[PDB]
Amino acid sequence: LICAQKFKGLTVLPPLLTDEMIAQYTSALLAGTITSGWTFGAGAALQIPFAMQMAYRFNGIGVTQNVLYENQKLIANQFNSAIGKIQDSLSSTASALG
Amino acid sequence: NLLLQYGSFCTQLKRALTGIAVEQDKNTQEVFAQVKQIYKTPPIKYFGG
Amino acid sequence: ENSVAYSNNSIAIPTNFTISVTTEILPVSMTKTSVDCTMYICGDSTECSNLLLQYGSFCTQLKRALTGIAVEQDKNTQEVFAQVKQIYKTPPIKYFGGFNFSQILPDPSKPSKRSFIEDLLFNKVTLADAGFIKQYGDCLGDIAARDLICAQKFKGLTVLPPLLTDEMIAQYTSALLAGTITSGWTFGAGAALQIPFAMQMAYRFNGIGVTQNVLYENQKLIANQFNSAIGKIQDSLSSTASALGKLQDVVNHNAQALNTLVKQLSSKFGAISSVLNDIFSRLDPPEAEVQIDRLITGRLQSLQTYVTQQLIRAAEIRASANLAATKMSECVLGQSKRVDFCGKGYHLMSFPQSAPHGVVFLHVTYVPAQEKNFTTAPAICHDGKAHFPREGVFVSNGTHWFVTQRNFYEPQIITTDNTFVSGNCDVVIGIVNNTVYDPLQ
Amino acid sequence: LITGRLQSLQTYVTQQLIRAAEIRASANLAATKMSECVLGQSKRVDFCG
Amino acid sequence: NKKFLPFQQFGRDIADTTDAVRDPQTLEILDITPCSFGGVSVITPGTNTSNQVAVLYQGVNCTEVPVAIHADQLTPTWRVYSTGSNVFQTRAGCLIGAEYVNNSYECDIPIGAGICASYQTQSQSIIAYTMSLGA
């Protein structure tokens, strides 16, 4: 049916940014946030170990650093289980997009 | 020839319609393009479990 | 592209910092307007009054809607600016820790107390040409080419002057700037309470994760960087003549709408012509009424379309004005913690300035630089007890260990009052041996 | 027939212009959310999850 | 004063408006302007309190409003205001029927150009003054 609409003058223009480079920006942002925390938002990128950043973020929400260094394995296991669950849930329901 | 009596009416329509066409591109560019460089992860990946 | 030397025991820390001045512009109001009905529809004929009154009182809806728009405009401007119940005057002394303020402070030695920068903007735009009937009705004898505004007024399309004039807006901006320079942010809560500027800057640094000792020891550098930034922004804004954009966009949009409306007057509408008197006199009433009916319907439809479009643009301007008011209330009267909401980088303060149809914010911020590499560890085990930092992190140039802040290199020795302890040291994944200090031993 | 078709085109253009502003507001909200809750940690409750 | 060319007959402006026309006899180009007109607004303090009103003619110097009411043929209840009993010329046209005090207060009823009008009991009447931002 797109051809019929085209032969009535209802031209549809293509977007300037293709999907691939949108994915490239998203991957760049994800790399920045995984490897440099937040400092690359303001200035240049600054490498820092991941556990350090998680300790910082716990220090943000009213909890001291001594909860993370002796719960690392539980944190990782729950994170991985949750991400597997979200993958399965998204793959299951196709009407959640809305 | 008969529309020439109404003249530039659809010219006005085109001028109005092009605005949202450029605005969509502006919106996408604003929402995503906010990084000066293009980083990339190191080949070895072990982020603490 | 820019790769990152990621690892699991490496960390970079900035050593130096810079102050940068950023500029942003926000529109706050379009141009109010009114409309005449009978003189636009056909131009001063009795038969028009005889024939159109039974078509309905559509121009009543037109007038009420456009009046609603007009009142919404000055409502917006008074909500976005009138947020201080007093007027504050700077003292004759103008020394603030070496922070120069000649450019943005109001100038007594000038007709109207408009400061330097806002004068620069007002002369950079120079495209409104007033036009808010600055005692118009003087274009009776048009020796010149009559311009365009008088002609647009003479077709039944008037423009009303805004409620607030420019000089009182400048007074409000001066009051805001004086309040934010002399009494910190306390005047946002209640009565202004004076604080010397240097300790206000110390407070603001204490806000963004850095202790006051960095400022009191480098005041001259801060003053020099601030003054250089102010000069640079002066030069940069004076140079570029197309950095505004948005205000010109609004003005051009309104002008285009009015021009389209006035050009639409010469449509045939599938009739003999766009002339009224010839059509009435030449024809006979049974067909003259048909032709007049067609003309009236066409012109009413066009006017309705214009009214709808203006109504549409009003909402966009309203949203922009509300966002501008929120930004003015947060960034100026406080110190926002929302990143990239009052300028790039960690935020320190902001100053407002007026503009012929909007506001311009100067954001003064913080940007680290000159980083250095170091090796780190989460904790130190001593005598079987782990030890964690108070607020900083552990670093080492290779031989000795230190606690430092998170945005400025400043080593310190590991003392028992600069850390704390939890459990034994067989559970953490990155323990490194060292010693600790108890000052009283 | 000319007038009717022109009127239909005009009302379609008006409706599209209506939808454009709503999409613009949604894009502004999305840009704010990405700039805040990705490049930093937000203290506002229920703004992000 | 604007000059034509010997063949040129009458002038026109942007948006096809006639501005100046050369007289056929003297061959001198005279200027044509649309007749005087404008909008009227009524300043009212409230029906319950008083029945004294002010009038405002928008976008015109009103050295010629008495003639405007004479030609428009409105009642002498309008001709009394057409006569210059109390006329003040602001930026937004002019207002008739309001005394202009020289002090400052806050603003209740806006008009324009930073000038307001309010009802005051000294000699109850409708005064008009200049806006004051605050103390």
Ligand SMILES: *[C@@H]1O[C@H](CO)[C@@H](O[C@@H]2O[C@H](CO)[C@@H](O)[C@H](O)[C@H]2NC(C)=O)[C@H](O)[C@H]1NC(C)=O
């Ligand atoms: C941080 O940077 C500033 C400027 O980028 C440095 O100050 C400059 O130092 C050089 C070296 O003598 C002088 O020639 C300049 O005149 C200085 N600039 C100003 C504005 O005074 C500063 O030294 C750096 N900090 C450190 C610790 O090196």
Ligand SMILES: *[C@@H]1O[C@H](CO)[C@@H](O[C@@H]2O[C@H](CO)[C@@H](O)[C@H](O)[C@H]2NC(C)=O)[C@H](O)[C@H]1NC(C)=O
């Ligand atoms: C703040 O900066 C302005 C920048 O102009 C300084 O104004 C200059 O003052 C000197 C003083 O003799 C004059 O010679 C210059 O001509 C001024 N500049 C201009 C462009 O005219 C001002 O002095 C600075 N503030 C302080 C306290 O020195």
Ligand SMILES: *[C@@H]1O[C@H](CO)[C@@H](O[C@@H]2O[C@H](CO)[C@@H](O)[C@H](O)[C@H]2NC(C)=O)[C@H](O)[C@H]1NC(C)=O
């Ligand atoms: C790491 O930094 C520390 C502190 O600046 C250095 O320790 C001092 O270095 C100076 C200069 O050589 C000596 O005079 C002091 O005696 C040192 N203090 C101690 C307690 O040893 C250290 O040399 C630096 N190491 C490296 C590899 O850069």
Ligand SMILES: *[C@@H]1O[C@H](CO)[C@@H](O[C@@H]2O[C@H](CO)[C@@H](O)[C@H](O)[C@H]2NC(C)=O)[C@H](O)[C@H]1NC(C)=O
């Ligand atoms: C930090 O020092 C302690 C104290 O020596 C080290 O603990 C030793 O661990 C080995 C490993 O089996 C034992 O054989 C030793 O008996 C332990 N020492 C003592 C005194 O019991 C620990 O390994 C050191 N950690 C690092 C990273 O060097």
Ligand SMILES: *[C@@H]1O[C@H](CO)[C@@H](O)[C@H](O)[C@H]1NC(C)=O
């Ligand atoms: C960092 O990661 C590498 C790669 O997995 C690993 O060999 C090394 O032991 C890690 N560092 C520490 C301190 O465990």
Ligand SMILES: *[C@@H]1O[C@H](CO)[C@@H](O)[C@H](O)[C@H]1NC(C)=O
């Ligand atoms: C830190 O070390 C890495 C690897 O040796 C290097 O690429 C990087 O440039 C260093 N940091 C700085 C600020 O030079």
Ligand SMILES: *[C@@H]1O[C@H](CO)[C@@H](O)[C@H](O)[C@H]1NC(C)=O
């Ligand atoms: C109306 O007022 C203006 C401004 O004061 C003045 O220039 C003009 O001459 C006045 N009109 C008449 C007829 O005097």
Ligand SMILES: *[C@@H]1O[C@H](CO)[C@@H](O)[C@H](O)[C@H]1NC(C)=O
């Ligand atoms: C009003 O006060 C001003 C003071 O600037 C004065 O110049 C003016 O003559 C006064 N007018 C009247 C009518 O009192």
